[PDB]
Amino acid sequence: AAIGSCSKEYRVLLGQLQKQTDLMQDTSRLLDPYIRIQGLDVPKLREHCRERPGAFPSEETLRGLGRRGFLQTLNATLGCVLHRLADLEQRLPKAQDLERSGLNIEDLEKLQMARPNILGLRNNIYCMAQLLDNTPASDAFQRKLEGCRFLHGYHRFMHSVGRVFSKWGESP
Amino acid sequence: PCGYISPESPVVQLHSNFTAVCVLKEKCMDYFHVNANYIVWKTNHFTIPKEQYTIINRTASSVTFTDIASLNIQLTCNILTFGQLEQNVYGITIISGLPPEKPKNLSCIVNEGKKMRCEWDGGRETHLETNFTLKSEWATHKFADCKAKRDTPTSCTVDYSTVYFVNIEVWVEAENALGKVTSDHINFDPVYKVKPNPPHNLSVINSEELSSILKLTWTNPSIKSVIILKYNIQYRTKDASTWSQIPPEDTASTRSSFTVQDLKPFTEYVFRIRCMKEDGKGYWSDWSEEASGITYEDRPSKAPSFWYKIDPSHTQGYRTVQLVWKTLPPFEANGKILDYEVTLTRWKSHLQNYTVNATKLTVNLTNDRYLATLTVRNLVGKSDAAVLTIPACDFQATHPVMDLKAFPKDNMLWVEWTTPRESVKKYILEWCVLSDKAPCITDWQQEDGTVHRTYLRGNLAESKCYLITVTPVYADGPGSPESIKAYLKQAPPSKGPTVRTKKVGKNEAVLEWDQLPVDVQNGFIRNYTIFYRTIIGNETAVNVDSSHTEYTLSSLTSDTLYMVRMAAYTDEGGKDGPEFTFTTPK
Amino acid sequence: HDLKCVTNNLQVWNCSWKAPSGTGRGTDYEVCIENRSRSCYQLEKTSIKIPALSHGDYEITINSLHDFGSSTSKFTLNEQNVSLIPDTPEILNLSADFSTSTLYLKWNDRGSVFPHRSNVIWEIKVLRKESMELVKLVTHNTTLNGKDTLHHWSWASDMPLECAIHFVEIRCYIDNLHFSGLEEWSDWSPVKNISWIPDSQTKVFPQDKVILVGSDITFCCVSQEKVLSALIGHTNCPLIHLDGENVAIKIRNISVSASSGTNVVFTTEDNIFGTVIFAGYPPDTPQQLNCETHDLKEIICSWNPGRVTALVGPRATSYTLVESFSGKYVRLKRAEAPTNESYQLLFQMLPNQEIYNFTLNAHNPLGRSQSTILVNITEKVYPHTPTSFKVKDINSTAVKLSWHLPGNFAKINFLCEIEIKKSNSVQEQRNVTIKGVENSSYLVALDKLNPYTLYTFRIRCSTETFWKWSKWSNKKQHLTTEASPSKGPDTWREWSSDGKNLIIYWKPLPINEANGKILSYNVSCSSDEETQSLSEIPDPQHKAEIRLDKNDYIISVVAKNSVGSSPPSKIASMEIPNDDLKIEQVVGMGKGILLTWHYDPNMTCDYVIKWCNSSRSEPCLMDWRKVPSNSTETVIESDEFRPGIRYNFFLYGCRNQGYQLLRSMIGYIEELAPIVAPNFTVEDTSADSILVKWEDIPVEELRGFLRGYLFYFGKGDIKVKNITDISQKTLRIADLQGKTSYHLVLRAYTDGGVGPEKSMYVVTKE
Ligand SMILES: *[C@@H]1O[C@H](CO)[C@@H](O[C@@H]2O[C@H](CO)[C@@H](O)[C@H](O)[C@H]2NC(C)=O)[C@H](O)[C@H]1NC(C)=O
Ligand SMILES: *[C@@H]1O[C@H](CO)[C@@H](O[C@@H]2O[C@H](CO)[C@@H](O)[C@H](O)[C@H]2NC(C)=O)[C@H](O)[C@H]1NC(C)=O
Ligand SMILES: *[C@@H]1O[C@H](CO)[C@@H](O[C@@H]2O[C@H](CO)[C@@H](O)[C@H](O)[C@H]2NC(C)=O)[C@H](O)[C@H]1NC(C)=O
Ligand SMILES: *[C@@H]1O[C@H](CO)[C@@H](O[C@@H]2O[C@H](CO)[C@@H](O)[C@H](O)[C@H]2NC(C)=O)[C@H](O)[C@H]1NC(C)=O
Ligand SMILES: *[C@@H]1O[C@H](CO)[C@@H](O[C@@H]2O[C@H](CO)[C@@H](O)[C@H](O)[C@H]2NC(C)=O)[C@H](O)[C@H]1NC(C)=O
Ligand SMILES: *[C@@H]1O[C@H](CO)[C@@H](O)[C@H](O)[C@H]1NC(C)=O
Ligand SMILES: *[C@@H]1O[C@H](CO)[C@@H](O)[C@H](O)[C@H]1NC(C)=O
Ligand SMILES: *[C@@H]1O[C@H](CO)[C@@H](O)[C@H](O)[C@H]1NC(C)=O
Ligand SMILES: *[C@@H]1O[C@H](CO)[C@@H](O)[C@H](O)[C@H]1NC(C)=O
Ligand SMILES: *[C@@H]1O[C@H](CO)[C@@H](O)[C@H](O)[C@H]1NC(C)=O
Ligand SMILES: *[C@@H]1O[C@H](CO)[C@@H](O)[C@H](O)[C@H]1NC(C)=O
Ligand SMILES: *[C@@H]1O[C@H](CO)[C@@H](O)[C@H](O)[C@H]1NC(C)=O
Ligand SMILES: *[C@@H]1O[C@H](CO)[C@@H](O)[C@H](O)[C@H]1NC(C)=O
Ligand SMILES: *[C@@H]1O[C@H](CO)[C@@H](O)[C@H](O)[C@H]1NC(C)=O
């Protein structure tokens, strides 16, 4: 029924991967909605939503890694981000409460659209791999800063993987 | 109850094999002393013969049908008791048995930020329900399915968000109560089936410096950052309905502005735009709202027409000469006319200039030779000067035109003439309607000296005599005017001429008649006729030319009353006039 | 020289005096009281403890014992001169609540010291701000009963205890009505402070509190580094410098909290600390609480919460419904319904129990609400929508219905309403009652309806209690039986031009008469000896020919249906001749034309009047109408009657099995005066005679039968000469004079009026 690899043209597969990465690297689409919906829409609190060291792999490591190890690391990272995003979705309030308080549901829409983007990226990574054939309790205010740091690290990793994808053009 | 026909409610395919078995119980068997040998089969139309059903055992009977071509068949098994008595037991029915066939024409379309919708065709009629379901899944992930609704069995909207740049394989599987069958398997990228949203908020901006450019501005959809899109701009004027399309080679890139060229004169235009993917894969968006826009105006200049007229009432020492000019056409004026400037220059004397906001100006003129110019002013300046020399009081107009001809062509009179030997500059055509009660309404038109055949640009009336007057315009003065009469469309006269007897003799009578007025002729009278008859004799006819107004009658008898009548004929026809009666003396 | 006595137990007076001037250390004193029994003692200090004496003045003599002389002085002490100074109290235990920031004090009153009852007034003083401050001062009154009683005192604080150290002091002041002396206040107890160990695990206090919108709340922030400011969302707050680097802020009338809560943060040099506060509202009373059932098995009850509680997530308001007679309770899960069905809960019924007294209770971390109502489960049943509605035929004038109703209604009855919707008519409704059963299909048959008619059936049913009406079921369209013949069609016979064939005409029976689709017509022209020519003609052919040799044959046209035959309509074929025929004229009054004829006693069966178009050479579209013999004046109603068209009416008489013609009448639907006068012109004129000729007026503009012409002439003494001859179109006038202008006027007149006139002026010849 279902085919092994979703596509057989390496060129269009690489193009799809690059376009998906350039689309998912949108800070204003992913991180800013979170800070806006979390009530931290002030410059003083925004100055602290930064990436912590040791959260995501580095650009030097991503450049030094090969192809199959790169794909496996990206797969594991996507799984971890999917788990954390499911946790955050469990944490965020409901759309009716957002509208009552005065916030916007565009942030929730962007998150619920970005999660299937991660799913599709994982599926495309699997297609490429087949085609190549070769804390007891935390504070309510601390959780928001943790979300800031995690999302900033995720955006940094997305920028790194986008630069990586743009580095290598074609491969036999 | 004592029997039952198995199966209870069968639905077999039309024109197929079927077998019905009516099994009875021992109660009626040992009550009526019967068995399966007495079981008979009778349908709703006829009785099944004996050689058509086979007895299974002592309490069972089976019948077969080799061809089912009816929509409803009431099969009832009956028993034969003592005394040739028949008793009903049970009955069944078979309704609407036919299998369906697999579908085709699998096509899916994706909207902007919405779910993917796929369609197909139903196929041949099966007289039965068929639940169509399509399977959509990735290389490693399986999605949900759609159930064919009863309103439209060829449409489905998925429940998951469209993930772009992911080749998905989708196929429709036809499933019914008689088997399953799947259609072809196709794979496609959902970004290739995206139907973009039509652009909104289209505005047209003109320019102040140039008069042939328009700055178009519109809003691009939100998918402008994902894929590169092209545009198609169709523009047209307000009077013409044909839409001129801009070549797509100039709008093959992502842009929100464009300038149209080659629209000079004061014209409002309507614009509309659509958009789709750059490589041409997908569907074109809807057409944008029709937006209006007026360009900047250009101010060229054209040559006007000028002519002068002199009245017969001459003052002692001065003459009253009136100047008349025609309004420039919109294609020649190319703007709003402001005022007219006419200059009067004598032979080496003072210059006189006058500004007139109308199409007529009369001035007191002397007996010397003058030269009048006509310069119309517009928003940018003035046009060329219409040179026309006004002759003196003692100047004799000579060198007239030759070969004066006038005949209607295409419901329009065309006056042609031979140009004189001299170098003619312009030509003027004066024409008026002839009437014994109303004067001439002098309408004129000016044309170049190179054409020797023109038509009267005006609202001409039929059945009217027009006195066309042509005058050649030279460098010193106008030529000798020539007059000619013509008709737009000839018609029979409204009334006939009245006759009268001048002298009646013993065998001769002299008649007399007046010429018909030009208002009742309605054409060129060619010849006349006189109908003189007798109360007892027959009516005769006689021909007479139009140049003669009298006629004589010969071979007349005495002591007899004669009745005469006269008609005026034209190229279209003629009408008889009043009858006259006179007697012959002895 | 100064004696001041104090007492702390109302039983032993501790009198103290000053030493005289010149008395050194180690001085012996002999002091006593002049009483009923002189008992003097010897002491070494200037402080004697004497028992409580009676009411009165007592003499006290002091004796300073020295080796160089003795001193003797007297003193007068009374009960009004002794001061009451009780002993100082002592704090036994001091505990403080850490979660609620509440203090607890325990102290003993030592009631065994005083034998009589006395009112004791305690004054507790709460301190803080270790440098210096005073906050609380509350009075406490107790009662002594000769026994030591341990009292308790509690007080809640507003500022978190983790930001300041507190102090506690308390004194007492007894009231003795039997003591006439001076009562003084007791000394303050030793200071007993409470200290908290600064572990400093967090910074801001409190953490995730649930307070009401509109109350006062004070925050604090313990820190060892310098702070900058405090922010509540986007609004600033003034800082209150506490001990050390600790700061505090005050919030009055706090606004409504958001989804994530009004985070109160304290900005610092390099970091930031803050917590979340949740401001909510008490739970509203559940409104519109009405419980009902659908199948007498479950109780589904809904209610409207009204005003929102402003608290969601792990602190949402939970609802709890408990039974009164059975004590059974149910609790709603976390999954809540959308706004359209905001709240609904199912409750299982209890067998052999019909009266229900429900009490719904809601509770949030801020408060609680309740609501009571008494409901009768047998009067609040919702009839379920009937399904599987089928239509079955029985016979010609009846049809059967059937529908299914799930539920155990075996004890109640149903009142089902059957709606009869006949096409192109008025909507009909029928009500029928049936005994309810347990999960079975009900079958009700109706009758007394017109056959051959399509109907649309839909039924809705309600209980006898008449509480709620069930929804309308799906409409079902069904056709009735074949037909039912009632009467026979109207027939009429005519003879052909050859005198041999007899053509027969008949009208189709209407729907209200045929009550079904006609299949064929059974025609038969039979005599009194033998039935012949039995043929059947189908629709839509309404004419048939049958060759007959004699005129005594009777015609029996019978319409055929699917069930039987229509009643036969007999008509005679013999045509009795009548030579005494006369043409008559009739005038149509409006749409119909009246017919008047004399009653003939010899007529047997009825009267027949036929008519067609006489202005066409094509065969007529003959129509007839049977009129009984008892009628003498009738009118003809037909849509084919048009103005200006003449119709020939023939009246036949039914005399001795034969149709004999009586009257032949012609006329129009409308007859009035002519609209235009006949145009006339002069041909010849003499000196004593004239000649005129008018053109015949067509029947289209005459609008009736022209009776003649009225010609008028006179000088212009006028003369009127009527010409009743309709064929005479020529008129001449004699006895005329010359050179006289006459006015000739011609005017036409009819039975329905006089038309206009035309005039002209001519001069006679000479
Ligand atoms: C990518 O990570 C997943 C873990 O989530 C690995 O396991 C696969 O998980 C998917 C989940 O739908 C299953 O469909 C696969 O069958 C799992 N694979 C195996 C081998 O069990 C997955 O293997 C990883 N991919 C690669 C290429 O390493
Ligand atoms: C059902 O029973 C009928 C009657 O016995 C049979 O139909 C035969 O079908 C075959 C195959 O199409 C034909 O060649 C024969 O002519 C049919 N008639 C007979 C009498 O054999 C058969 O037994 C059953 N039909 C099917 C399609 O199985
Ligand atoms: C506050 O209370 C503490 C005890 O809770 C007091 O500390 C005591 O001080 C006395 C006298 O200096 C010592 O004898 C005790 O051993 C101390 N208790 C301890 C160390 O637990 C303290 O003096 C009180 N006052 C202040 C201002 O801190
Ligand atoms: C219905 O049940 C309640 C028990 O929950 C009975 O008790 C009443 O409870 C309400 C609580 O809102 C109190 O306000 C009443 O004072 C209680 N009444 C008594 C008599 O205890 C209640 O009585 C029952 N209803 C009836 C009509 O008896
Ligand atoms: C609750 O409803 C039941 C059913 O409607 C009531 O029982 C009825 O009582 C009346 C007395 O007036 C009888 O005539 C009916 O026959 C009863 N119906 C039955 C037995 O089905 C009952 O009275 C109601 N109770 C209250 C408190 O309203
Ligand atoms: C006869 O055949 C019928 C078929 O249904 C069934 O009753 C049974 O198999 C047989 N019964 C007897 C009594 O032989
Ligand atoms: C599929 O449907 C389309 C309708 O848009 C039309 O081309 C035709 O009906 C079908 N074409 C093919 C190739 O089946
Ligand atoms: C463009 O103009 C329209 C109508 O004038 C109006 O909706 C708005 O100003 C613009 N459109 C949008 C989507 O903002
Ligand atoms: C008079 O001139 C003005 C220009 O200022 C303009 O209205 C037009 O040319 C003239 N008016 C009329 C009524 O013709
Ligand atoms: C024409 O005469 C007018 C006098 O009113 C003068 O203002 C104008 O300048 C003259 N034009 C030229 C071209 O000399
Ligand atoms: C100007 O013309 C008018 C019109 O005829 C007339 O008064 C005369 O001819 C002239 N008058 C003067 C003063 O030039
Ligand atoms: C309610 O709060 C506002 C500030 O939000 C304050 O100005 C007002 O005085 C308060 N009202 C009362 C009654 O305390
Ligand atoms: C048809 O059946 C109904 C039963 O409801 C009965 O009343 C009626 O008489 C029957 N009519 C005939 C013609 O049998
Ligand atoms: C209706 O429910 C009852 C259970 O009380 C059952 O006995 C009966 O068979 C059911 N009837 C139908 C038609 O399902």
From Swiss-Prot, chain A:
Propeptide processing is not important for receptor binding activity but may be important growth-inhibitory activity. It is found in: Secreted. Glycans are attached at N75. Keywords: Cleavage on pair of basic residues, Cytokine, Disulfide bond, Glycoprotein, Growth regulation, Mitogen, Secreted, Signal. Belongs to the LIF/OSM family. Growth regulator. Inhibits the proliferation of a number of tumor cell lines. Stimulates proliferation of AIDS-KS cells. It regulates cytokine production, including IL-6, G-CSF and GM-CSF from endothelial cells. Uses both type I OSM receptor (heterodimers composed of LIFR and IL6ST) and type II OSM receptor (heterodimers composed of OSMR and IL6ST). Involved in the maturation of fetal hepatocytes, thereby promoting liver development and regeneration. This is Oncostatin-M. The lineage of its organism: Eukaryota, Metazoa, Chordata, Craniata, Vertebrata. The chain holds residues 26 to 216 of 252 of the full protein.
UniProtKB/Swiss-Prot annotation, chain B:
Induction: LIF and OSM activate the type I OSM receptor while only OSM can activate the type II OSM receptor. The keyword S-adenosyl-L-methionine does not apply. It comes from the Eukaryota. GO terms for biological process: cell surface receptor signaling pathway via STAT; ciliary neurotrophic factor-mediated signaling pathway; cytokine-mediated signaling pathway; glycogen metabolic process; interleukin-11-mediated signaling pathway; interleukin-27-mediated signaling pathway; interleukin-6-mediated signaling pathway; intestinal epithelial cell development. Residues 1-586 are extracellular. Changing G122R: Correlated with increased levels of soluble IL6RB in blood serum. Two extracellular parts of IL6ST/gp130 linked to the Fc-portions of a human IgG1 antibody (sgp130Fc) inhibit IL6 trans-signaling by the IL6:IL6R complex and has no affinity of IL6 or IL6R alone. Also blocks IL11 cluster signaling through IL11R. Residues 99-190, 198-298, 303-398, 400-491, 492-586 form the Fibronectin type-III domain. Changing Y164G: Does not induce ligand-independent activation. A motif (WSXWS motif) lies at residues 284-288. Component of a hexamer of two molecules each of IL6, IL6R and IL6ST; associates with the complex IL6:IL6R but does not interact with IL6. Forms heterodimers composed of LIFR and IL6ST (type I OSM receptor) which are activated by LIF and OSM. Also forms heterodimers composed of OSMR and IL6ST (type II receptor) which are activated by OSM but not by LIF. Component of a receptor complex composed of IL6ST/GP130, IL27RA/WSX1 and CNTFR which interacts with the neuroprotective peptide humanin. Interacts with HCK. Interacts with INPP5D/SHIP1. Interacts with SRC and YES. Belongs to the type I cytokine receptor family. Type 2 subfamily. This is Interleukin-6 receptor subunit beta.
From Swiss-Prot, chain C:
Keywords: Cell membrane, Chromosomal rearrangement, Disease variant, Disulfide bond, Glycoprotein, Membrane, Phosphoprotein, Receptor, Repeat, Secreted, Signal, Transmembrane, Transmembrane helix. Signal-transducing molecule. May have a common pathway with IL6ST. The soluble form inhibits the biological activity of LIF by blocking its binding to receptors on target cells. It comes from Homo sapiens. Heterodimer composed of LIFR and IL6ST. The heterodimer formed by LIFR and IL6ST interacts with the complex formed by CNTF and CNTFR. GO terms for biological process: cell surface receptor signaling pathway; ciliary neurotrophic factor-mediated signaling pathway; cytokine-mediated signaling pathway; leukemia inhibitory factor signaling pathway; oncostatin-M-mediated signaling pathway; positive regulation of cell population proliferation; response to cytokine. Residues 1-766 are extracellular. The WSXWS motif appears to be necessary for proper protein folding and thereby efficient intracellular transport and cell-surface receptor binding. The box 1 motif is required for JAK interaction and/or activation. The gene is LIFR. Belongs to the type I cytokine receptor family. Type 2 subfamily. The chain holds residues 51 to 831 of 1097 of the full protein. One of its GO terms (molecular function) is leukemia inhibitory factor receptor activity. A motif (WSXWS motif) lies at residues 469-473. It is linked to Stuve-Wiedemann syndrome 1: A form of Stuve-Wiedemann syndrome, an autosomal recessive disease characterized by bowing of tubular bones and other skeletal and craniofacial abnormalities, respiratory distress, feeding difficulties, and hyperthermic episodes. Most patients do not survive past infancy. A chromosomal aberration involving LIFR is found in salivary gland pleiomorphic adenomas, the most common benign epithelial tumors of the salivary gland. Translocation t(5;8)(p13;q12) with PLAG1.
